[PDB]
Amino acid sequence: RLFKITALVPSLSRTRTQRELQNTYFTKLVPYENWFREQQRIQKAGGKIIKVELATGKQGTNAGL
Amino acid sequence: IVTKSIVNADAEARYLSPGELDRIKSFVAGGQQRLRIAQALTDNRERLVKQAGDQLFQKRPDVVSPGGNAYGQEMTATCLRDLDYYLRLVTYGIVAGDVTPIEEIGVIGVREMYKSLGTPIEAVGEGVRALKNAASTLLSAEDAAEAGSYFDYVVGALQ
Amino acid sequence: IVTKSIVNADAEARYLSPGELDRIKSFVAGGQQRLRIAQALTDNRERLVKQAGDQLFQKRPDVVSPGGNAYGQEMTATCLRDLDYYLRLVTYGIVAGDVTPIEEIGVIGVREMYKSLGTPIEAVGEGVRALKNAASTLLSAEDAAEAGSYFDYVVGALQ
Amino acid sequence: IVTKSIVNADAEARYLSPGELDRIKSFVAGGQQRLRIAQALTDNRERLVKQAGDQLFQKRPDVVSPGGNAYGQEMTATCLRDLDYYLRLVTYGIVAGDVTPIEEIGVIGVREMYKSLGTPIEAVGEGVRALKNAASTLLSAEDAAEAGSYFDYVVGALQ
Amino acid sequence: IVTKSIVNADAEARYLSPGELDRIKSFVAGGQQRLRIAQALTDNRERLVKQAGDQLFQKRPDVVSPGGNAYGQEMTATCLRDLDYYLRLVTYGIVAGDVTPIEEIGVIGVREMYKSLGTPIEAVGEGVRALKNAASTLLSAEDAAEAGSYFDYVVGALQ
Amino acid sequence: YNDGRGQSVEVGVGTTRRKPARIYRLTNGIGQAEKQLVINAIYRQVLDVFSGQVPDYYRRTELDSKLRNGEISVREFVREIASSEIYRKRFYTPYPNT
Amino acid sequence: QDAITAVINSADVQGKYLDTAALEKLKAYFSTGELRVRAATTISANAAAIVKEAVAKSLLYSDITRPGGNMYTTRRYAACIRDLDYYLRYATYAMLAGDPSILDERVLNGLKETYNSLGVPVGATVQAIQAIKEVTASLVGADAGKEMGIYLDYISSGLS
Amino acid sequence: DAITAVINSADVQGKYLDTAALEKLKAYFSTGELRVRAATTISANAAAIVKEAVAKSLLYSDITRPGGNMYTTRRYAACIRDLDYYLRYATYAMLAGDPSILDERVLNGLKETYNSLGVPVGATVQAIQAIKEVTASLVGADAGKEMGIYLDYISSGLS
Amino acid sequence: QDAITAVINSADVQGKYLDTAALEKLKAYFSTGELRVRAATTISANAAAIVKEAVAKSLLYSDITRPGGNMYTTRRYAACIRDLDYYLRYATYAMLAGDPSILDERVLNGLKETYNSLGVPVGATVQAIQAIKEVTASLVGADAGKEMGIYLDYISSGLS
Amino acid sequence: QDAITAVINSADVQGKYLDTAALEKLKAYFSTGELRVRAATTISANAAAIVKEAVAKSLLYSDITRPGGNMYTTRRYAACIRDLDYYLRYATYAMLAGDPSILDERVLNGLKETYNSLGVPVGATVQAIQAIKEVTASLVGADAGKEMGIYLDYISSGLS
Amino acid sequence: QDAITAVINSADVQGKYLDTAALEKLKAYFSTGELRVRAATTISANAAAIVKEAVAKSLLYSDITRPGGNMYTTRRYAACIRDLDYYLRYATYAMLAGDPSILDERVLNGLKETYNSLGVPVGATVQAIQAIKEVTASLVGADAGKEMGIYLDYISSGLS
Amino acid sequence: FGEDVVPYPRFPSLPAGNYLGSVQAAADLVKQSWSSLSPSTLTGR
Ligand SMILES: CCC1=C(C)/C(=C/C2=NC(=C\c3[nH]c(/C=C4\NC(=O)[C@H](C)[C@H]4CC)c(C)c3CCC(=O)O)/C(CCC(=O)O)=C2C)NC1=O
Ligand SMILES: CCC1=C(C)/C(=C/C2=NC(=C\c3[nH]c(/C=C4\NC(=O)[C@H](C)[C@H]4CC)c(C)c3CCC(=O)O)/C(CCC(=O)O)=C2C)NC1=O
Ligand SMILES: CCC1=C(C)/C(=C/C2=NC(=C\c3[nH]c(/C=C4\NC(=O)[C@H](C)[C@H]4CC)c(C)c3CCC(=O)O)/C(CCC(=O)O)=C2C)NC1=O
Ligand SMILES: CCC1=C(C)/C(=C/C2=NC(=C\c3[nH]c(/C=C4\NC(=O)[C@H](C)[C@H]4CC)c(C)c3CCC(=O)O)/C(CCC(=O)O)=C2C)NC1=O
Ligand SMILES: CCC1=C(C)/C(=C/C2=NC(=C\c3[nH]c(/C=C4\NC(=O)[C@H](C)[C@H]4CC)c(C)c3CCC(=O)O)/C(CCC(=O)O)=C2C)NC1=O
Ligand SMILES: CCC1=C(C)/C(=C/C2=NC(=C\c3[nH]c(/C=C4\NC(=O)[C@H](C)[C@H]4CC)c(C)c3CCC(=O)O)/C(CCC(=O)O)=C2C)NC1=O
Ligand SMILES: CCC1=C(C)/C(=C/C2=NC(=C\c3[nH]c(/C=C4\NC(=O)[C@H](C)[C@H]4CC)c(C)c3CCC(=O)O)/C(CCC(=O)O)=C2C)NC1=O
Ligand SMILES: CCC1=C(C)/C(=C/C2=NC(=C\c3[nH]c(/C=C4\NC(=O)[C@H](C)[C@H]4CC)c(C)c3CCC(=O)O)/C(CCC(=O)O)=C2C)NC1=O
Ligand SMILES: CCC1=C(C)/C(=C/C2=NC(=C\c3[nH]c(/C=C4\NC(=O)[C@H](C)[C@H]4CC)c(C)c3CCC(=O)O)/C(CCC(=O)O)=C2C)NC1=O
């Protein structure tokens, strides 16, 4: 139900003067429904995905998630 | 005032302003007088707390009424300890120049706390107002304006 | 310093802090000396601008070189007018105590402007540094620290 | 329960569920008994309000103490009118099946209100608990479970 | 506007002077913009009466008050029907290009009618002002100017 | 020549519309009062609190725990607080979809 | 707003409680609510077939679906389907509430200005809503059909 | 501010800050001392000010009765927060010495908001006048009328 | 997940339908669900008094509430109240579901690492949860009290 | 929209196909599209020099750039540069499309109300756009220069 | 965290007030705070020249700025400039606070893993930070220069 | 925006006529009641 993600996304636009440490490197909990498109956004931005982990869910659950 | 200036210039992308450096210079220049005020309030801890608490019980007899919260010797001792804690935080705020020590030690979640303790907020606030009046009578005049305005922040933030 | 304190207490939900009210009190107390510094800089407008511009052309002869931007009487008159504008903004910042008049009149979009004008930024900055040195020599010593630190903001913000 | 089901199926893109239509059918089937409970509570308005208020003043004598808010005939009449208002909202919630009439008429902003009125929240809550006990003694047993659980929502939402 | 020039040249024994023919040709040219403005005010009538009643009862609450004339649903429906009538006459004056077919039906005897109906005329003028404001929000700049023309005539006429 | 008085600094876009008053960024390690101020700023922008000193609008307990821990990202909080029925009751059902 | 919340709001503006007149209104609402639930199920059964039969009866093979009409383009045809699907769904909601004010506040707030600005014809929408009314009256029944038709005619009168 | 207003007026002129603007700034500094003291004594008991104002003006009337704008609990809390807002902004406009920030902050859209919501204007004007009397009694004479200038500016902007 | 959805998921992994063993489990769940509803009402009555009595019995007047402890600061005390309150609310949810997996997935996912990283003591939380268990067992009853205590002890075992 | 999509839309409202009149319009558009590409390159070469020469010819050393004018402040001067840079870029886009409707829909939608509300003078913008027109007509050529000037004069007429 | 808030936090963990030892630490901090303000002004004067002199002394004309190095690309060179600009700015902040914990929490939290994952060399950054330390020590003075160098060496030790 | 950045109201100049729309959008002020269970009468009392 909840994924534990950890990914880096570099800056391929112009360089930013704000620190932006979190954007470059983050670890966040994403729900299962949003995770496909949110991954696809990191897929688009050319960033590496380091660590994917199921936080809450169990594999192979047919009912009740 | 250094932490607040640094985080305010941190929210922007720029350095510390000349105005803010003037603020830090004036704070350094007034810091010795603030240490004198902290010296007087440290050494007058007992009688200030007792006079303020007894002024509170003169104004508000509901807390020491048997239906009230501060009924009994132990409960009223914890009442005076709460007033001691708030006077200690007022001295910290007078020294620092910020109210961030007062805030993140004793202001930020006090309403939910005193709601769950059964204690009325307004009587705490009246006791800190009594502390303000007592420390205003002890100190020098515009020095008492300085101390009582931090007391005023605590009083307005408790309610 | 009143506008910045008000917008900083506006970003939070709370009033003006006792620390900030001490800042406003100290700013009021130093305001008369700041008006004296503004009086001296207003009355020394001509020779300060001319000495700073000629110190710039002593340091940087590229602008008055015929490949440079400030080639000719009219171009160098506009050069001295730019230095006049920046000295005027420095006097505004010395009076206000903020750097928000300096910023939102002459700092905020100056890089893109002088890029489109063909003018080098660093020579503007060296001219304002020459203004800082000249006004430092004219004024009283720690008064010159006050004036030159606003000049220092303008110099560091132009580059 | 129709409004809440409709807005819950409105947040989704789909129609009303078979489960929710069973909920509406069961609510219609119990609606006549709910009108009977509303009939009893309408006709017992006086003595329920007076017994609950006097049970409150037996439990909490601070409000009718001269330092308290409900000191005097007019203030205590407004106290009983507040208890009347809350019993009226409880009857509305028993009829509707939702607590949205109780909420958007008397729950949603009551803390800030009674903070600005100087009135303690917990004594209001104790009075509504006394109303719950009185209306529980008047009605039939599991009918009193029904009435007292809406009373329980009001009591838990006031604190 | 053609009847105006025709009776104007008809009181004289002369023909229509060709400057009047120029103004008729120019009105004939502008008739398409007049028709679009009239259709835009036509299809959006109930919005304009709603916002006019909004701004009027917001401005003058005495018609809402029971001593005033527009008290109750029937009287307030007659009030919004009067505003509907005046919007209709304004569209007639927008098409006709000159204020004769709107003054002939709404202006020429309105003061004694509203005097022997009990209603004040200033509230009707404020209602047509609210209609002008709502139509100014509904239309573009060159359309709102040309609509506020005839709305302005009605507002000046009712006073 | 200041014949029509020219134009002041704020006549066009303005000083206030040009730059926001403060921009709040979450970090791993930060002051606790600053953390509470950023968390209140998300409610103030998203839920339209009308500059209330205290947000009367209800705060999800799990969300405040997750955001002080920093384990979920801030845009995830924005999604979860926008989909909650506080925002639904305040802005979806009274208004048409357009 | 329901019929129940309308009754409660009317009694609250009066400042009194719910005595026998309001109670009899509530008993009336409960007695019709049974068949209202059954009609909601039988409407949510074949909403797509209702919209399909309505557009096939009214809007198809006309000038608006031909080149040079408002329903010519494929995105415009899909917007037409979703608008009629909405009118059916919100008429179902207003049927189950027994109260048209939620329907008015939901769609009749801005759909007049939207259909004005986009150039959508009003009368073709009124004909399509009338075709929905006939199809649902034939599908559901007599009294629940006219209960549906009351709010569908409320939509059609609000657009006009 | 008043300072930025002086700077903007001189900038429109295109000249510097000579003696007339300097004397305005000295005037602003001399009143800024008592302005700081009034800001502290207003931030002391803002809740008591709003409580006394609503108890003097808005309570026990038709608008707080069933069938009024302040009947509902949500609406009463919105009333408290709006009066709290008028006091806080009037404090900000007092400390700036300039009402344009107050105008741009609240008088931008509060007219249309109170129009669309059906909020009565005159009851708000009475409540703002009650705030003006309470703060004039609490603070003092000259700082009280300094507060009352911007509170009357709010009350005139809403009307 | 409920007990019902757990029964359905177990039968679905088997690939068969709901015959008599699963039906008897469902009848058992219905028979206890009546008293589960009554216990949910009597727990939602005085949740604040339950947390107050629990902290007054266990956490107050100790070293952690003194200066130099985890519950010294006012924001830390409020976090303790909220945390204690959460354990009561989610134990109520897991009581009404008849199934602790929703409780596990909700809080025991990350609360171990959170209390590790913040330096929150585990054993004081276990004592506070046990005090909640005693207070709710005294307040509600015997069998609903031990039904509450099963999931509260599940929380206390998951934190340890 | 292009000239091609304009031709297709005109034939689609007619409901017929693309026969010889539309085909001859398309052949005309292709023949001018070659020099349109060459002009786009030579405009994107020195857009900054074009804006610099235009403001130096028209806007500098006047009352609006003096204290007490709309272009006095440094942020206002930068907004002026970016607005003229826009007018050049969108006139390049409308030149390459061969169609001014994209230009109209892009900027002339709201720039009238924006320059009304901000107090920006219209006639100084018209003079600046005319100076851009002269600079680009001198830089590019005769026929591509007047092709650029058609859309620049369209902008200047839309602002007025 | 400042030096003042560090003193207050140390006394708060003790549970006592601010008597003479903490007061003497605060008097010491005030006496150095004057020259700290003067150094902050003279550092914010020419931060760009400091970064320029540092990269010209250390990083230029080496293998990392050549093709086949970490600083070859134009975006990588700009990232290098902004990273050194950061190290100077946060060393200025840590100088004015008199306390390096804000600096540590601010950049040394994740910059180790970031420079690990991106393949950024550590030792070249240490050399660049040392060049910044020499340039600021030559520019500001002796004692404020070594006060700056304490936190710059703290950064360089945290990256290593 | 950014990720750790809270959303903040900003007025862009690149899309055409968007400045005016954003000024009018931030100038409406949520001119309706969110719950609207009981409507207050005309001018309240
Ligand atoms: C404000 C506190 C803070 C810092 C310091 C910070 C650094 C930081 N440096 C980065 C990249 C980088 N950092 C460097 C740095 C260097 N290359 C070298 O050879 C030298 C040893 C060193 C320059 C002195 C380079 C070249 C990249 C880009 C590498 C790439 O193309 O992916 C990135 C990845 C995204 C990016 O900016 O492109 C971050 C987040 N972020 C922060 O929040
Ligand atoms: C430094 C910030 C800080 C504060 C403020 C604080 C308050 C505090 N007050 C407490 C009790 C108490 N507090 C009061 C207070 C009062 N009696 C009244 O009626 C007055 C309104 C008020 C006096 C101001 C009373 C009567 C108790 C005992 C209540 C009980 O034992 O249940 C307790 C629980 C027992 C204890 O640990 O002492 C705490 C933690 N703790 C803190 O760390
Ligand atoms: C109050 C804020 C403010 C500033 C700063 C400002 C600058 C400014 N400098 C200009 C020109 C100029 N500015 C310079 C500047 C310089 N020569 C150099 O090499 C030096 C680096 C620099 C002297 C500091 C030159 C040479 C010109 C003439 C360029 C031209 O005519 O194309 C112009 C265009 C002509 C004019 O209107 O005077 C403006 C608007 N205007 C303002 O309103
Ligand atoms: C339908 C929702 C609703 C509520 C709840 C409500 C309360 C309400 N309580 C009031 C006063 C009051 N309310 C109380 C209440 C109490 N005395 C206590 O100590 C107890 C805790 C509490 C009894 C429950 C008192 C003493 C006053 C008089 C205070 C004053 O006059 O300043 C007033 C102002 C005077 C008035 O208009 O009657 C309102 C509007 N109004 C509403 O429309
Ligand atoms: C097209 C030309 C035309 C006009 C001008 C006109 C006016 C008109 N207004 C009337 C009533 C009315 N008119 C109003 C007017 C108002 N409500 C107020 O408070 C304001 C003062 C004002 C409108 C905002 C009211 C309240 C009544 C009902 C008065 C009554 O019943 O005695 C009536 C009598 C009832 C009726 O037959 O409609 C006439 C004839 N009729 C016309 O055919
Ligand atoms: C891409 C299509 C497009 C355009 C063109 C556009 C223009 C635009 N110009 C603006 C302001 C402005 N525009 C100007 C323009 C001028 N001043 C003059 O005297 C001259 C007549 C003219 C320069 C040639 C100035 C000075 C401002 C800022 C005024 C202020 O300080 O508020 C603003 C308000 C926000 C801002 O940028 O500061 C917008 C949105 N937005 C768009 O999306
Ligand atoms: C809803 C499921 C759920 C839970 C339970 C949860 C807990 C949680 N507890 C926290 C902190 C905390 N938790 C405690 C708890 C305690 N201190 C003690 O000594 C006791 C042993 C225990 C109280 C009984 C304290 C004191 C903090 C704040 C520590 C700090 O100042 O950083 C935090 C960090 C952010 C914060 O709330 O301040 C989270 C996320 N989050 C969730 O989503
Ligand atoms: C849920 C309440 C609700 C409704 C009803 C609603 C309608 C709505 N219909 C729209 C367009 C449209 N509506 C139609 C409708 C029709 N064309 C006809 O000829 C018929 C008369 C009618 C179909 C029966 C068409 C063709 C468009 C697209 C027109 C275009 O291409 O711009 C649009 C503009 C955006 C879009 O959907 O493309 C809205 C917002 N929005 C809402 O929130
Ligand atoms: C910061 C500048 C600013 C202000 C002032 C502001 C006001 C404002 N007041 C509102 C409502 C309201 N305002 C009131 C105010 C009052 N009722 C009365 O009887 C009194 C006369 C007055 C209280 C003193 C009430 C009762 C509502 C809610 C009405 C409803 O239920 O719709 C709303 C609609 C949304 C809401 O808050 O519920 C706005 C936007 N917005 C702003 O951005």
Swiss-Prot record, chains B, C, D, E:
SUPFAM superfamilies: Globin-like. (2R,3E)-phycocyanobilin binds at C79. Keywords: Antenna complex, Bile pigment, Chromophore, Electron transport, Membrane, Methylation, Photosynthesis, Phycobilisome, Thylakoid, Transport. Contains one covalently linked phycocyanobilin chromophore. The chromophore is added by phycocyanobilin lyase CpcS 1. Gene3D superfamilies: Phycocyanins (1.10.490.20). It is found in: Cellular thylakoid membrane. It is a peripheral membrane protein. Heterohexamer of two alpha chains, one alpha-B chain and three beta chains. This is Allophycocyanin subunit alpha 1.
Curated annotation (Swiss-Prot), chain F:
Belongs to the phycobilisome linker protein family. Heterodimer of ApcF (a variant beta-allophycocyanin). Phycobilisomes of this organism are composed of a two cylinder core, from which six rods radiate. The core is mainly composed of allophycocyanin alpha and beta chains and of minor components. It comes from the Bacteria. This is Phycobiliprotein ApcE. It is found in: Cellular thylakoid membrane. The chain holds residues 937 to 1034 of 1132 of the full protein. This protein is postulated to act both as terminal energy acceptor (by its phycobilin-like domains) and as a linker polypeptide (by its repeats and arms) that stabilizes the phycobilisome core architecture. Has intrinsic bilin lyase activity. Contains one covalently linked bilin chromophore. This protein autochromophorylates.
Curated annotation (Swiss-Prot), chains G, I, J, K:
Its main location: membrane. The keyword Electron transport applies. It holds the Pfam family Phycobilisome. Heterohexamer of two alpha chains, one alpha-B chain and three beta chains. This is Allophycocyanin subunit beta. Light-harvesting photosynthetic bile pigment-protein from the phycobiliprotein complex. Allophycocyanin has a maximum absorption at approximately 650 to 653 nanometers. Contains one covalently linked phycocyanobilin chromophore. The chromophore is added by phycocyanobilin lyase CpcS 1. It is found in: Cellular thylakoid membrane. PANTHER family: ALLOPHYCOCYANIN BETA CHAIN, PHYCOBILISOME 32.1 KDA LINKER POLYPEPTIDE, PHYCOCYANIN-ASSOCIATED, ROD 2-RELATED. GO terms for cellular component: phycobilisome; plasma membrane-derived thylakoid membrane. The modification N4-methylasparagine is found at N70. SUPFAM superfamilies: Globin-like. Gene3D superfamilies: Phycocyanins (1.10.490.20). Keywords: Antenna complex, Bile pigment, Chromophore, Electron transport, Membrane, Methylation, Photosynthesis, Phycobilisome, Thylakoid, Transport. The keyword Membrane applies. It is a peripheral membrane protein. The gene is apcB. CDD domains: APC_beta. (2R,3E)-phycocyanobilin binds at C80.
From Swiss-Prot, chain H:
(2R,3E)-phycocyanobilin binds at C79. The modification N4-methylasparagine is found at N69. Keywords: Antenna complex, Bile pigment, Chromophore, Electron transport, Membrane, Methylation, Photosynthesis, Phycobilisome, Thylakoid, Transport. Contains one covalently linked phycocyanobilin chromophore. The chromophore is added by phycocyanobilin lyase CpcS 1. The keyword Transport applies. Pfam families: Phycobilisome. One of its GO terms (biological process) is photosynthesis. One of its GO terms (cellular component) is plasma membrane-derived thylakoid membrane. The keyword Electron transport applies. It is a peripheral membrane protein. Disulfide bonds: none annotated. CDD domains: APC_beta. It is found in: Cellular thylakoid membrane. Light-harvesting photosynthetic bile pigment-protein from the phycobiliprotein complex. Allophycocyanin has a maximum absorption at approximately 650 to 653 nanometers. Heterohexamer of two alpha chains, one alpha-B chain and three beta chains. PANTHER family: ALLOPHYCOCYANIN BETA CHAIN (PTHR34011:SF3), PHYCOBILISOME 32.1 KDA LINKER POLYPEPTIDE, PHYCOCYANIN-ASSOCIATED, ROD 2-RELATED (PTHR34011). Belongs to the phycobiliprotein family. This is Allophycocyanin subunit beta.
